[PDB]
């Protein structure tokens, strides 16, 4: 241990951690890869997603070459803070967490050649701008961009450790998504210009597709059943005015309850989503069913119904007879057009 201890104390001798490797001499190349331990929940209201990663950074520092029995050293959490490391940050990050339980969730290794492997465990909240026009039948590409906050591309450049497709790895038990499926990802890199210069940006897009089953049982089925229930009024006799008025008016209140609740889960956007049109059309159908009876009642002549053993009686309305076909047919047609358009 004493022989080993001397090497460590010698390494940082005259070492300035405020200066990047090869300062004023060359560009510091950082090789990076990510292992997503759990792709956390996605929040539509906040337009953000959580992601738990093992953020691995690798680079070379000639000042940290060493010779000894071992060819790889696993440094302590304290050592990593004594040396220069890249100031990587996430461009679209909102509020990230570096885990400090029980100790700092970091690891720094050094090979004899001076190659540093540096890993940390992070929970990142990131911005994912969502265009929710096709909601809840929408797909999104949530990005994850990172780079050096302070060092321009003339000083620090980032790269992927291996092929870009094989550089972002998701754990098999990593999907922590309740309402989405992680179809895959695309890995890219580029350049971004800002007021302070040009910087290398490493980007990753996670392609997500929303699960629709929640909205079918919560929104679509009750709305469909409410529309069906509004049409069931067409099969009641025209003389039961209080019954068909209660039937139609209470179906309207059910649509209003359903329509308001569906939006409250949505973020406060100002355009019509896919679910908005379906609810609007269902609202029109239930609205038109009560207007239809208003017309039927306006032409009813006798307040009494057929007595079952025949004094004249009202005939069955021609408005009702046609509505028993037109309303189910138009709604059926609207569903084929709606579901084919978005699926």
């Amino acid at each position: 241990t004493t022989v080993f201890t001397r090497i460590l104390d010698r390494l940082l001798d005259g070492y300035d951690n405020r200066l990047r490797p090869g300062l004023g001499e060359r560009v510091t190349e950082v090789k990076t890869d990510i292992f997503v331990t759990s792709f956390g929940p996605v929040s539509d209201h906040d337009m953000e997603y959580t992601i738990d990663v093992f953020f691995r950074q690798s680079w070379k520092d000639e000042r940290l070459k060493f010779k000894g029995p071992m060819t790889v050293l696993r440094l302590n959490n304290l050592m990593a803070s004594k040396i220069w490391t890249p100031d990587t940050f996430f461009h679209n990050g909102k509020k990230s967490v570096a885990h400090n339980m029980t100790m700092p969730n970091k690891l720094l290794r050094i090979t004899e050649d001076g190659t540093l492997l540096y890993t940390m465990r992070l929970t990142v909240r990131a911005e994912c701008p969502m265009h929710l026009e096709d909601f809840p039948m929408d797909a999104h590409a949530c990005p994850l961009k990172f780079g050096s906050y302070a060092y321009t591309r003339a000083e620090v450049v980032y790269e992927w450790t291996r092929e870009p497709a094989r550089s972002v790895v998701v754990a098999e038990d990593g999907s922590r998504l309740n309402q989405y499926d992680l179809l895959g990802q695309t890995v890219d890199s580029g350049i971004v210009q800002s007021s302070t210069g040009e910087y290398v940006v490493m980007t990753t897009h996670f392609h997500l597709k929303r699960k629709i089953g929640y909205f079918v049982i919560q929104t679509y089925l009750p709305c469909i059943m409410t529309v069906i229930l509004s049409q069931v009024s067409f099969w009641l006799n025209r003389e039961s005015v209080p019954a068909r008025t209660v039937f139609g008016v209470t179906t309207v209140l059910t649509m209003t309850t359903l329509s308001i609740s569906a939006r409250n889960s949505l973020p406060k956007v100002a355009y019509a989503t896919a679910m908005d049109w379906f609810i609007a059309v269902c609202y029109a159908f239930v609205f038109s069913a009560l207007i239809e009876f208003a017309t039927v009642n306006y032409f009813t002549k006798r307040g009494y119904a057929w007595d079952g053993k025949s004094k004249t009686f009202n005939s069955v309305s021609k408005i009702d007879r046609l509505s028993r076909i037109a309303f189910p047919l138009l709604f059926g047609i609207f569903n084929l057009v709606y579901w084919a358009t978005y699926l």
Binding site: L19, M120, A150, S195
Partner: protein
């Protein structure tokens, strides 16, 4: 590399961080520019907004001048603790922080002449007192006040670096509920009991998106109001049908108002949404109250005339209310 290391050591050797540049001399001029990464939340309930920005400060410190190195020295952000930095703060912020993953999002860049570039990535929740009389047809003006905490104008002066181009990224901002109509940069002095202080203000003008409220708030109220007029076309003797329609729409209007009213804080003054919702509430209230006169004036003691006129007056009066409302608020 050691030559650069020796240079940096010399600058901080004997460096006094408790003394501003040119202490006792002319005030140090600090120039600021901002790159706005995003505006995340603009909440009426909390009457604030969230702002993620890149915040840069420029000033000249002769103590940090260096020669022989034909490069700008970008240094590890941990060197900022060993330098004098302006005591800048956001006068109207409620809660703010500097991001710290993977490291603190802080930048220190030196220049040969002594110029210091101090950049931070900050998410700040800033207080924006909103005027909600015309809500949701309202236009807001939210500011960000940048002032020195301890130093007066005799010691430190602020200016926007680059004039009206000192703030960038505003055109790229997308808000789910607002549009950035305009932004302005102001520079002035504020006088307190302890002396005058330099002030920089950044302000935005926000116009609210009305399309969303039409589907959510206005449309259900409009349809229920039209529904309440269905009562005028039903026979006077259908008491059960007309009361059931009348009382259930009054219930529906309360239902509409309740599950919407939780979207706004307890702000006690009249707003545009309140007038429209109460205009429709009064109409459905009168449609059910109108039948009380109809039923009584037949059975308790002409009947079709009152209903016939209501078939015109109620649609007409509601259109008159809509015309006056939209013109007044648009």
């Amino acid at each position: 590399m050691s030559f650069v290391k020796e240079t940096v050591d010399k600058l901080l050797k004997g460096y006094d961080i408790r003394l501003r540049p040119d202490f006792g001399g002319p005030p140090v001029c600090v120039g600021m520019n901002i790159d706005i990464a995003s505006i995340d939340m603009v909440s009426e309930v909390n009457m604030d907004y969230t702002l993620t920005m890149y915040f840069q400060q420029y000033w000249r410190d002769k103590r940090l001048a260096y020669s022989g190195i034909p490069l700008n020295l970008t240094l590890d952000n941990r060197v900022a603790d060993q330098l004098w930095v302006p005591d800048t703060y956001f006068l109207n912020d409620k809660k703010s922080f500097v991001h710290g993953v993977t490291v603190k999002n802080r930048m220190i860049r030196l220049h040969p002449d002594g110029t210091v570039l101090y950049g931070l990535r900050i998410t700040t929740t800033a207080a924006c007192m909103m005027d909600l009389r015309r809500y949701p047809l309202d236009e807001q003006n939210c500011t960000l006040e940048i002032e020195s905490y301890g130093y007066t104008t005799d010691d430190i002066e602020f200016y926007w670096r680059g004039g009206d181009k000192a703030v960038t990224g505003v055109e790229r901002i997308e808000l789910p509920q607002f549009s950035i109509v305009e932004h302005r940069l102001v520079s002035r002095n504020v006088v307190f009991a302890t002396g005058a202080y330099p002030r920089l203000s950044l302000s935005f003008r926000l116009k609210r998106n009305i399309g969303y409220f039409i589907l959510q708030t206005y449309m259900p109220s409009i349809l229920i109001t039209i529904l309440s007029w269905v009562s005028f076309w039903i026979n006077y003797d259908a008491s059960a049908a007309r009361v059931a329609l009348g009382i259930t729409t009054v219930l529906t209007m309360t239902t509409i108002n309740t599950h919407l009213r939780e979207t706004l804080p307890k702000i006690p003054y009249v707003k545009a949404i309140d007038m429209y919702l109460m205009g429709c509430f009064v109409f459905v209230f009168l449609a059910l109250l109108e039948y009380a006169f109809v039923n009584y004036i037949f059975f308790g003691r002409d009947v079709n005339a009152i209903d016939r006129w209501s078939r015109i007056v109620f649609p007409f009066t509601f259109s008159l209310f809509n015309l006056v409302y939209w013109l007044y608020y648009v």
